[PDB]
Structure formats: C-alpha cells, structure tokens
Amino acid sequence: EALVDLCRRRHFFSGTPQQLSTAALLSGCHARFGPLGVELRKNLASQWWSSMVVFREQVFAVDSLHQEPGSSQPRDSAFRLVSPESIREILQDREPSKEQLVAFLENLLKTSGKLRATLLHGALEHYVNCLDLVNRKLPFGLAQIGVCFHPVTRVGEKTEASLVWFTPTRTSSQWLDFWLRHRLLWWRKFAMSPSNFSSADCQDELGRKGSKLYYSFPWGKEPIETLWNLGDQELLHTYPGNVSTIQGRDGRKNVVPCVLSVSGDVDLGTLAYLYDSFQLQRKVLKLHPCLAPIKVALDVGKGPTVELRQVCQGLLNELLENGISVWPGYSETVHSSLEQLHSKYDEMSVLFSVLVTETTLENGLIQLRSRDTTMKEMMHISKLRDFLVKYLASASN
Amino acid sequence: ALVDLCRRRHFFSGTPQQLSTAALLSGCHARFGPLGVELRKNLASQWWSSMVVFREQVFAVDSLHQEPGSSQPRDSAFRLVSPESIREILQDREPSKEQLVAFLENLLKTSGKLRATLLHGALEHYVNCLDLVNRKLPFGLAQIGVCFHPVRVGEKTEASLVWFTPTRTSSQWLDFWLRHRLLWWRKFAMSPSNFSSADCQDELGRKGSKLYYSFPWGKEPIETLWNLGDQELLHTYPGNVSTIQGRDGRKNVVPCVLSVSGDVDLGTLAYLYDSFRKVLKLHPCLAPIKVALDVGKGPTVELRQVCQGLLNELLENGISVWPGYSETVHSSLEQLHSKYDEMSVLFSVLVTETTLENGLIQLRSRDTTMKEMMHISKLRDFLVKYLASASN
Amino acid sequence: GQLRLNPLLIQMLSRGLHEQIFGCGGEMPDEAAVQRSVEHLQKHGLWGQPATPLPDVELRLPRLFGGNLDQHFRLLAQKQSLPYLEAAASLLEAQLPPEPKSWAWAEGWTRYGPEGEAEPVAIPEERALVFDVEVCLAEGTCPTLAVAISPSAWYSWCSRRLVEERYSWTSQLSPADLIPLEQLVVGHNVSFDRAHIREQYLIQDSRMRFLDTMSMHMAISGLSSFQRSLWMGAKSWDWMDISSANNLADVHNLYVGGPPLEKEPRELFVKGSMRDIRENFQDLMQYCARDVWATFEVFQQQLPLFLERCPHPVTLAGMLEMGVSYLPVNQNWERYLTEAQNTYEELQREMKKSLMDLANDACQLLSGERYKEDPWLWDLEWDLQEFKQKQEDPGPPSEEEELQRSVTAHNRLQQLRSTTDLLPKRPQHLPGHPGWYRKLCPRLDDPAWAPGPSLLSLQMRVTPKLMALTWDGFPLHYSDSHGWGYLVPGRRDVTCPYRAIESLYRKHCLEQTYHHGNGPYNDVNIPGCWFFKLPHKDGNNYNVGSPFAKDFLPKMEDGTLQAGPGGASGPRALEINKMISFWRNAHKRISSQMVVWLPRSALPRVVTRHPSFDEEGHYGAILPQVVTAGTITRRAVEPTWLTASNARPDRVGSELKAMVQAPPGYVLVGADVDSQELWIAAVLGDAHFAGMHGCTAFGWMTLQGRKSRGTDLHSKTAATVGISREHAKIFNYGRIYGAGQSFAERLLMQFNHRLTRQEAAEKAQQMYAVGGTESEMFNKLESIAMSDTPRTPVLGCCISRALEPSVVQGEFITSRVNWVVQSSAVDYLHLMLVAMKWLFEEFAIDGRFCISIHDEVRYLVREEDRYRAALALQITNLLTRCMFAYKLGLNDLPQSVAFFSAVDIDQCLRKEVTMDCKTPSNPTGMERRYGIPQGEALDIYQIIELTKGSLEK
DNA sequence: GCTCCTCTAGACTCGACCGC
DNA sequence: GCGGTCGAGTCTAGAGGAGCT
Ligand SMILES: Nc1ccn([C@H]2C[C@H](O)[C@@H](COP(=O)(O)OP(=O)(O)OP(=O)(O)O)O2)c(=O)n1
Ligand SMILES: [Ca+2]
Ligand SMILES: [Ca+2]
C-alpha cells in the first residue's frame, strides 16, 4: 500500500487522487493536510519555535503582512492584488480608449500590492524595533512562521519558518556554520533515518555563499531548508538613507550587521517526516513522540457503560489539563474488533492505547498498549498521567 | 495614552501615523510588536484549547488564502493576477481595445481571490471530516487564520468555528455557543461588564448574535454568530445530496451550519485596553512575559550562572522568562520595576549575594507590588501552581 | 651521449652525474658473471624484454669532499655531530658533587653549587645537561618541576603554577609557560621531556639536539616483541643477562647495576593532585634526582658502547635529526577535534536508536509464538510474568448539567485512587513484556530511566541476534562452552528452527558437510545444524566473545559478516560501527596531543607579512614524542603520528594528518621513497649474486616492474594466486622480512576463510618455491644474520646484543633477517637526513625537519625556497642511492631509482596532493572549509627547469 | 613462533532483606 | 515460612600498553 493512500485514509493528507500526486504535493497549491496532518504540522512548528526562539538567546517573534508594496522589478513573478471594483468601473463606466486601457494595465504593475514570496522582507522592516528592544546590541535575530506564495497559471502556498540572524561579518561564517549544524541536528532529532537528511553548499547568481538542507524522498532529494549569507545590501535597500539607524553595537563599536537567512519548509518537512516514519509487517507510522498528533487513545468495552464512560471522561479531563492529546475512541457509536482498532491507532501514530474495562471500577487497573512494542501493560489509573508526562519529557530532552 | 505605552514597550508597532484608531482597526499594517505577537499567540492558544481541546468533535482545518474565484460581481475581494501576463500583453503583439477589454474581463471571470471569511475553508473539508467522525452529527471545524477585507488591503486574524448541526437543534447550540464565548471573553478581562452581547439580523433574515467590547471610543464587534442553515452547504456541494447528509440518530439530514467567528487582533487590542503609576495588569494566562530575572551587588560570573540556571529551569518547564540579567545597562531598581510593570511581567526575581549565601531569591508580585523571599527550588512549583490556578 | 647502459640492458646513471659521483675509469664487467646472470634471467623468462630509456639528466652537483662518496658523508656527519659529541664527552668526564640537601622553592631555575647552596638563574647557561621533567597530570600538560645536572653544578626548576597560589590558569599553553633552556639535552625517553621546552616550539630552529638513552639501549641491547614477552614473563635464556626493558630501573640494573631503583608508590604526578605534590615536594625532588643520576650513569655506560657498536657518525647525526620533529598546526586543529567528537557522538546516538528500534520490532514475534521460527531470537527468554494483586442528537448541556457532569467525573476518578493500598508496595518491572526485553529497559523507579530499551548496547549477546548478523550466510549463535560462532544448516540428526536456517541459506546462495572452518563442534548439539566457531586471531582454541571486535572489520567489509533481515536499521548499525571505529579506538591519543600556540611576537617576520596570514588566527606546533629507536630495528615509534593511517571517505577523524598545516610564508616539501625495502633487498641480492644491478630475477623485476603497467612484484604476486593487492603486499613484505611457510598459511587462511589448511599449505609452498626469484637475496640475508657480529651493510651499525648468536645460539633468526632490511632502511633515513641538513646549511636554505613517517621525509621549508628544497631532496636521494650501491661494491646506479618520482610541495601532510580528504567529519573537503589549495608534484626534469639546474639563490 | 599487565564490560551465581 | 528481586563476587573476553607523566 502506498503511503499517500494511508495518510489520506487516516486524514494526514486531503484531496482528490489528482491532488495526491508528487507534483501536486510539492506545488502546495492546495490544502494537503487533514486534521491529523494539521496537528502534526502544528507540533513540528512548535518544536521549531521552541528550539529557535525559546532556548536561544535574543531571538524574538515578528509578524509580517501577506501583502507587500508594489514594485517595478524587471522579472518579479509575485502575483498582484487588483481591486475588481476598479476594473468593473473602468470597463463599464466611461468607455475609455485603448491607450487608457494600456495605461491601466501598466498601473496594475506599478501600484498593485504583491503576495510575499519569502519572509526575509518582513523581518527587515522590523529591524529598528528589535534594535530598540535589545538596546541596539548584537547579535539578535527575528523568527516568524507564516505562509509564502510561489508561482507555479496557479498560485502555490507553502508554510515557511524563517530565522533572520543579524551578526557582524567577522562572525558571519562561524554563525552560518553553527546554524547549519543546528538545523541539521534539529531535522535529524525526530528522524527514524537521520541519514536521509543531507546538506550541501550553494551559490546564488550574485555570488553569495550558503548551504541548503535536503531530504531523500523516494523520488529524489528536495530542498527542505536553505541558508544564505546575505551582506549589508538588504538592510541598505530596506532603509535607504542615514546609516546610523542601521548600525548595531558589536561590543564597543557600531557595525552594520550581516544578515543570515535561514528558511525552512514545514509543509515539505511534514511530508518528509511522514515518509521517514513509514518503513518503505504491521503498517505503522513511527512518528517521534514530540511530533505524533495523538498520544493517548481511550476505549470502553464490556460494560456497564455508564460508569466506564464516566471514568473515561474523568481520565480524559485529567489528561487534557496537563497538555496531552487524547483521542476519545469510547464515544464512537460503531464498535470494531480490538485488532482493527489497534491497527487504526498504529496507522494514526498513536503513542499509547488505554482500555478501561469493567474491572477498572474495582481496582483501578487499565490495559496500556504501546505503539513501539505492541505490548499490553496493566497500569493503575492514578499512575497513568505521571507515566505519560515522564515519557513525553524523556522523549523531548 | 495606551497606544504610546504599547508602542514604546513593543506591543504595538508602526509609525505614529499608523497608530490612529482607524489605522489600528483597519489592519492594513502589522500592528503588533514582539510582545504584542506573544500576547496574540497566547490568546490564540487559549481560544484553540477552549474551543477544540476541551470540546467534543471539534477538529483542526487548514485552508488556502485563495479561492477559485468567480465572476459574481458583488465580490469585492482583491484578485490574483499574474504580472507576467500583463507584461506579455503590454510588451509583445500589442493587442487592441477589444482584446484589452477581453483580457480585463478574463481577470474578473477566471482568477484567484483572497478570502474574506474562513467559512468557505471548512465547507470544502466538510466531507472528509464527516467521514472522520463516521458521519456522526454534530461536529465542528475550527481554524485560526488571516482574512483579507478591503478598506489597500486590511488583514485581520480570525478564529472561526463552523458548527454543523441538525436543523431542529440550531437555536440551542447557537445560544450555548453564545454563552460559552461570552464567558471565555469575560474570563481574561478584569472588567467583564465591558463585554456585552446584542442580537442582530442578517440581510436574508437569518438570526444571529454579536459580541462587543466597550472601547473608549465606542463598541466594536469582536465576535459574530450566525445561523446560516443549509444554503451554504448546498451552494458548495451541488448535485447529489447523499454525500452531504450527516446522521441524526436513525434519520439522515443535511446539517445546518453555524458560524462562530471572532477577530483575535481586535480581541488582543480589547484585552490591552482592558489591562490599562502605569501598570498593565494582563491576565496571567495571557501575559507574554511571566518571569523577570535580575542580579545585584555582584559577583558577575556566579550570579549569572545562578540566573542562567534558573532560566533553563523555567524554559524546560515551559514558562517564558525575560532575561533581564544579561542587560549591559545597570538601570535602577525602581526603573526596572516600572519597566516590568509596563511590560506586564507577572513575577520579578532578584538574585543577590544572599542567594549565593543561603539560596533565597526575592520574588515581586506585579498585582500586589510586594517583595517576598523564596527558595530557588520552590520557584518553579510556585509559578506552575500560580499559572494553573489562574487557568481555573 | 649522456646515456649509459648495463650488460643486462638496464639504463644506468648518466655520464655527467656518474663522473661526479663514482669518478671515471670504472671496471669492465666479468664475462662469467654476465653469462650466469643472462642464463638465470633466461630461465625465468626475464631476458630480452623491451625497456623504454628515460631522458638523460645532467646536473652540477656540489663539491663532494674526500675521495669517495663515503668520505664525503663521513665528513658531513662529523661536522654535524662535533659540537654535540664534545658536550657528550664533557658529560662523560664531568665530576659532580653529591645531591643538594634541601631544594629551593622560588620560581625559575636554581643553581646548586658546592655544599648545596641555592642560587637562582634565568637559564642553566650550560652546553650539556641531563633532563627529567615532572608534570602534574591532573592539573594539565604544563610541566610542574624539573631537575637537571650540569658538569659545573646541579640545577632545579619549578613552574609558576606549583609555586604561585594563583587560581586556575588558561587552558591554552604558551612558550612562556615552559622550561627555558650548541646544546645537548640527555635523558630517558627524552622525547617527552623535549615537549616541555620553550625554545623547541619556535618556528626558527635552535641548535639543540637530544640523545635518548632508551633509543641507545634499543640500539645496543634492545629486545624484540617475543624477547620482551619472555623477559616480562620470567621476571637458551643466556640473552636475558645482557638485555633489559625500556624502563629506567631495568636499564640501570643492566648497565650500572647496584641498588635497583624503586618507583615511588605515592604517584603524586601520575595519580595525585597539586596539593599532594606541594606537600611532598622534597621527596619528589629526591626521586627526580635519583632518576637523573641513574640516567647520567646509563649515558656514561652507553655512549662509548654505542659509538663502538655504531662507529659511523651518520647514524648518530640521523638519530639527532630524528628527534627534532616539528609538526605545525593552526586553529583548524581545534575545529577538527570538535567536528570529529560531535560526529562520533551523533553516530553513536543513531546506532543506539537503530538498536532500540530493532529491539522494539523484535517483540512482535511473541504473537502466535513466531519467535520459535526466528533463526536468531529462538533461544531468548519469551516468558511473560503475570500481574500481581494483593440515538438522535441530544441538545447542548446546560451550565448546571455540564458542571455536575464534570464534578461527578472528577469524583469518580478520585474514588479509584483509594485502591493504591491494594497494589503491592514493590511494583513489577514490565510484566507484559518478554523476559529478554525486561533486561534492556530500566525500571520506572530508576532516577535515570529512559523510554524503551535504553540499556541495549553493542557488546551484549542480543545485539547480534537483533541485527540478524550472518557469517557467509550462516546466522550467528553464542554457545557458553565455545563463545560465539555460526550455525550451518543441512544436518539430518525451545527447538532451533533448522528449517529456517536452511531457507535463509538457500536464499543467500541463490541471491549471491559442505563447509570448512573452526570445526563442527558436535558437543553443542543444535538439531539440524552444526556449530562452527568464528575464526579468532589468537587461534582455534580461543573463543570469540563479541562479533563487533576490531578484528572483524576486514571480515565484514569483504561482505561475509552481513546483517540479514531487518535491513532498515540492521546494516545501518554495522555501517555506523565501521565508520566510528578509528575515532573510538584513538580519540584519547589525538585529543591529548600537547598543542602549544606561539605568540605573534615570537613568530618570524615572514609569517606576519604574508597575504594568507590572518590576525585572528593562532599558529601552533605539536612536537611528536617519537622514540628515535623504539624497536630492535631502530625505527621511530609513535602510535598517533608515525602510522599508515590515511583519510578515508567512511572514517571519522581520519584526516588528522591533513591538519598539520604549514604556517604562512612556509610550505611543506616532502618525498616518498618508492619501494625502499624491496629495493634494498634487491640490491643486496644483486651484490651477493654477481655484483651488478639486475643480475638477480628479483632485482630485475624490481627495476623493470611498474605498478601502472602491471609488472610490479605486488601485482604479479596478486595475479599468481588471486588475492587483493594489499594482501599480496603484506604477503611479500612478510616474506622479505623472513616469514616462514606457517605465516603464509595463516595469512592465506585469514584473508580467505574458505581455504582449508591443506590448500593454504600447498599454495604457500608453491609461492615460496616460485632455484627461485629471491633465493640469492635471502641467502645474503641469512649470511648477514648468521655472522658473528651482524652489522648493517651500509653504515656498519651492530645488531642488538640480545640478538647476537653468542647469546641466542641458533634461535631468533626470523628476527635478525628482518632486522637486516629494516636497519638498512633506518641507515638510509639517516643518510637522507645528514645529506639534507648539509645541503640546507651549505646553500643557506631556510627549513627544518618536520616528520619521517615510514619511508617518507617531510621538511618545513620557506616557500621562496621550495624548489631549491626539491632539488636538494633529489640530490640527497641520488647521493643516498649511490652510497648504498657503493657500500655493496657497486660503483653505479640504475636511472630508474636515481631520482624521486614526485617531490610534493603542499600546505598539509596529506598522502597525495590530489586527494581532497573527504571524511564523515569533514565532508566538504580540505579546500572547501579550510583554504588548502592542491599542491604540486614535480619530477626531476620539472625541478631542474624551475631552478636553472643550481642550488644557489 | 607469541608472555605480561590494568582495565571495562558483560553475564552467571549466590547470599539476603523483605513482603506476602 | 518461604520465595521474589537486589546487591556484590567472580569469571571471562576484549582492549591498551610493554616509555615518560
Ligand atoms: N605490507 C607492507 C607495506 C609497507 N611496509 C612498510 C615498508 C615501506 O617502506 C613503508 C611504506 O610502504 P607502502 O605500503 O606505503 O608503499 P610500498 O612501498 O608498499 O609501495 P606500494 O604501495 O606501491 O606497494 O611501509 C610494510 O612493512 N609492509
Ligand atoms: Ca624523562
Ligand atoms: Ca612509498
């Protein structure tokens, strides 16, 4: 069975079979994630945010608009925002001439806003605010997770996690190497096959040096993250005028920082992690415990159903208050055999399966099944939450 | 002025010309700083938890920012046009008046369109999520995303829940959602009386409700509820009906659609206004900065290793901490306290020579403005307890 | 013309060089010898073969002093070794007052004259000294105290760390943090003591040389590995009274005797700390003085004996020049170390994760009792311990309804909490999981608990079973009576699934009683299978305990020790184990190298004013602790640097040699001798048979063979019986060293386990029997070894007293036949060093000796003198080859071995300039992330053009 | 041909607190 | 009263060296 079909059945991917092809998945022109896929991507984005901001010094959140001011660049392919009302007016109000229509079409390429293709421009506009926040100290950084639009005609949407790192050029190379190593380690942390995450140096048309991470998809390698060593040109272009406001304190001296652009693709990263999980035997998605959308699954059988469901509802409330995702399989009206339920949970990358039987009302013991070992362990209810928290904490660090 | 205080503390961003009430409410510029972004993220997390995690049969939905787009004129959403086409039109065969007219018509007839509401995003995922729940009604779809509305394009981040129900139970579910949303909005506010509700009627006569926050200039709609019926679902799914019928007991029925949509940018603005010596008493579950670490009287290396450990401690636990010890500027204690008050810092931690001697760290509470001593080992547990308490 | 030939049609040296080196006249070859050589070559089919002549070389060599080439080298060595032998003789004739009563404590050197009067001095201010350095191992590599003796008065020195009560110092060392000091410094294992000298790390060379009593002991009365083993075991045996180990106590007992030295049981430097060293300062100083006096007595009793057994001064000059090794390093060394360690840790983590995944996937065989059919996990414990005990849609709930539902759910959940008393106070450890999986997982009570099988490791007996390792298609099996092994299916005599073994072997044979090996071992009695042990290096009697040992890496690279089923993470773990073997086995030595970084002030003016120089960079030097004579063969021994390791695309940390980088303004000029030992054996055979190069078949093949074309000895040996080149090279080198037929048989069995003992014996006999190609070369080696006093046929260096036939009778012949060739090679190295130093001093060439690995010579020469250095290397090689021929009675030299094939000029010590040295630790390359352009390899013709055929600037 | 050592690691064995 | 885990004790195979600290 193909992995894409399994993901579609278990709601990791969404769309028609025409949208489940490799080209359609890579394009990003359509919503390609179900609720489980959305939760997996949210977990991946939260891990990236924690690693790159929370545990890192002088990295701050930045918000940027999807629209950018219009530009007259020679070959910008970014789609333009045109008001339909203005077009309707022009075309059915005063009947202009051919030259007037030519001018109107020219104006659409001179004042119409454009959808952002990268998050680099958004972070640069907030450079002064972050300079003021850090008392003009260096090195600081800006991180943002958002949607970037890319031409494919059709428009493709891809979610980008971008870290813009400001640092003096004297440490630009060491910072670039450290960031490359850290990103490689972060991508290989949750990978069952870390050897499939590669790295290679690339050069742009302007001669700048940089790296580019890869993942070995079955069809071939795809760039899941790119690092660029951009000079001071970007900051100067974004702030044409006095240089005093652009300079940052490199200790006892004021230096214009060198911009490092670290750009990851979390949609392609989630696809890569879904491919890494499947072995490519029991069909099971061996997602990392920090990335599994569902960690605990509850079930009820051999009633009385009222007491068992009340106990399961109490356990669900207890687990949710501690930040554990639980799939309430007891509320399902249609019941299936435990073999099919176990197969479904394994295909959904559910870490643990909890079964609350009628014997639980007497001694409090529940049957705990693990995804990794497919072994059932009798554990007491009061000790389930602590075990799950300890397991998640150990799997995190 | 609250706006200036939030701009100087990195809650609000932009030029002073963009700090006007109209500019703030339009959403045409990124109006939030890093602290504002963190506060908005905390509010979004609270909304997501209360509406999905602690709710039955509510699931995540991810939808595109563009719609297939159509000729329907009433549409005012900005369109998506490839610049390369226009360049080809203007720098090549050089067509004529009629051909330019045809090209302009084709832009409105067939092109992308920016979304104005998240309602249509969930309706496209209705079938897949219905299959996910084994067609068991009721179930809902929640999504927090940015929507574009013409004012220049204004951007507003909207948290929307599309609650599919059988027709008979529409009113009860709508009232339950209204009361739940009102309680959720009033939970984080020091002045719950400022939040209010008022019934409203749609153009097509569909009944609904709205939630308002009493801003100092007036009441602005922060959330709007509607009873859309089966019109939208049938519009999005023409042809066969058996593929959009949920299960209501034994009988099947096309579910009614309830639209629960709130603006989290305007909600963040309302909570900033409610939080307002200048002190911002943000709710502890919403405050972007909870722990502030400070040093005093030296020595440097040992205290910084102390504060550094107290920081990895609170970061592993999951508590956001502002590293105020790494600051090169040696500001006064009262200045630091005032700055932390302005930045809505929950608790301030002071590390001195006594901490090296005994191990006690002075803890200052923003609400009571009192200084208390506490051991290092008990700081994490106290912070976790305090956060848990506030969350309930 | 300039072309000279040989009666065997071998191109000889050109007239221009021949008249300068060997003079004119010569002697007509004898008709009988030429006829015999022609007959011998014709019998082997090595006569009349075509040979393309090489272009003639003309060069004006520098004035060769004396009559012959030998007198020139003697004069050069005597001039180089005069100021040091003078100091050595002064030490021999020195009279020294007794040890001082009370040592001083102030910083710096202290002079102790008569009656033990203390007097501080900045430096000893003496020509000759005997050195002994004590360093606090716990504190670091910086020396702590040092005691030295002089012919005038005693001296002592203590570091500032020992004296001053300051807090912890910086990690990086400086020349100002070392012992301050022509000059001669003597000691036991003086290579270690040399590394603690300030002036020894400067880029410019100071006139200081070191005599190591251990090297002289090995040259005089050294012990072989077997001799060392016998001597250690005991303490035909008449040689034990004249030989001793390299310890100072054993050497003192052997050469001076008297009251034997006793090692201090306190061991403050080895084991203690700074405080203990401070407390017992006087006793440590007394022990150091005892060691210094013992070394002085050893030197007094050794120097005349060493000069009598090694009368040629070239040997002494070379030994003095082998002890001044200087490996320059920069800030890239720290990078390399950090990258290698990080890669090693990452690969260890990945391998552990793969093993945990294999263990987790192995548990699924419990269902249906499928583990009984697994070829590997059939015998494990799969027991499981039992647990021990002591509608239509309703509308939305109202606020009261939801509140009461929540509170009643909470109360119902809290009611079950009272059942904690009903549970045993000692919880079970994973009863549901099988028995073997319980061991691999830590208990929940453990404070160091980790999820899954976190205790699994490579060394356990279940890892090979989880990885499904197979030996030639046979699953591995551990027998307590015989260790590890493998099961061969097909026998017709929980039960092991022999049918599964048969199916697996059929699959392996189709996709890629009938087996020979360590023995069927019918005592194990596994139904349907036989138990053959894994071949151990020590022998069939010994039993293996781990198939992941360092002796199985060649066996698994050949495709025999393969991971079978579970191929997702199975073979990946084996690949990771192969990749990190070198770093695992040698990270302690590499990371502990004593690196000292010079200040910018101490750097010469050339380095600071170079375009490639960087102000933020640090240039340092690693001084190898090379024992100039660490074996009976007098070859330098160093585990870290003096090895055959080279950068590999699948080894972590293999590029350590590439990290030795020349400083700006200087370049590393090197050259590798092409088949040095083979050529030495060939020329010995040629001089023994008929007195002319190429008379022997072995010499003719050595001179005419070419690796590329496929006529060389190693390629022909490999093609004769079908072996790999490296294995054939090992075979041929062992045979030349004197290995018997048993060594050949064991090598054939080890390289190809499919060979039986009888077939290996037959193949070894056929190879050794080839009236053969190397008979005369060997007869010569046996004659030299069996003489009364076996001396080197070039410099006349006498053999170790422990190997003379007067004390070993007819024993230890395989050692002496190897000693002859290896000591000839060492004398060749000595001649090379003497000639290179003479050429550098005469023509004012700025450079110094860098390192001598195996048959390679490296010189840190200024860049502006890189071609002059290459021409000097070519001239020295020509002179050494001519001297070797002259000492054997041959006043000529073949053109094919007269000059180097390529004199490397590179910024690092890589094996070849074309290599990029990509390794899991440095995947990009040397040039990509360090700035090392490829070097230039030049032949003699290219060097002549760029130097105008002269050495003067 | 082929000793010794000190060492780490692993696994089998047996006495022994302690809870049932 | 008795057996269940647990903590050393020991036995053994691999590894590093046979120098100086
Ligand atoms: N099997 C071997 C090979 C080499 N050496 C020694 C003798 C040489 O002087 C030195 C370097 O030899 P290499 O193996 O590096 O090169 P070779 O001299 O063997 O030439 P080739 O590699 O072309 O066979 O190492 C040895 O003892 N045993
Ligand atoms: Ca010494
Ligand atoms: Ca060579």
PDB file of C-alpha atoms in Angstrom, chain A residues 22 26 196 198 212-217 219-225 268 272:
ATOM      1  CA  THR A  22       4.059  14.037  -6.193  1.00  0.00           C
ATOM      2  CA  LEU A  26       5.263  19.554  -3.942  1.00  0.00           C
ATOM      3  CA  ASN A 196      18.233  10.816   4.694  1.00  0.00           C
ATOM      4  CA  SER A 198      21.551  15.900   3.740  1.00  0.00           C
ATOM      5  CA  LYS A 212      20.859  24.052   1.591  1.00  0.00           C
ATOM      6  CA  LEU A 213      19.421  21.099   3.504  1.00  0.00           C
ATOM      7  CA  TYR A 214      17.868  18.149   1.675  1.00  0.00           C
ATOM      8  CA  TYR A 215      15.646  15.167   2.412  1.00  0.00           C
ATOM      9  CA  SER A 216      15.903  11.926   0.439  1.00  0.00           C
ATOM     10  CA  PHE A 217      12.347  11.450  -0.774  1.00  0.00           C
ATOM     11  CA  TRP A 219      11.575  10.134  -5.991  1.00  0.00           C
ATOM     12  CA  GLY A 220      14.625  12.224  -5.114  1.00  0.00           C
ATOM     13  CA  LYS A 221      16.122  14.913  -2.940  1.00  0.00           C
ATOM     14  CA  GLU A 222      14.148  18.096  -2.291  1.00  0.00           C
ATOM     15  CA  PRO A 223      15.349  21.318  -0.627  1.00  0.00           C
ATOM     16  CA  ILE A 224      13.615  21.473   2.762  1.00  0.00           C
ATOM     17  CA  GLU A 225      15.728  24.315   4.178  1.00  0.00           C
ATOM     18  CA  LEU A 268       7.660  19.698   2.971  1.00  0.00           C
ATOM     19  CA  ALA A 272       9.430  14.238   4.777  1.00  0.00           C
TER      20      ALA A 272
END
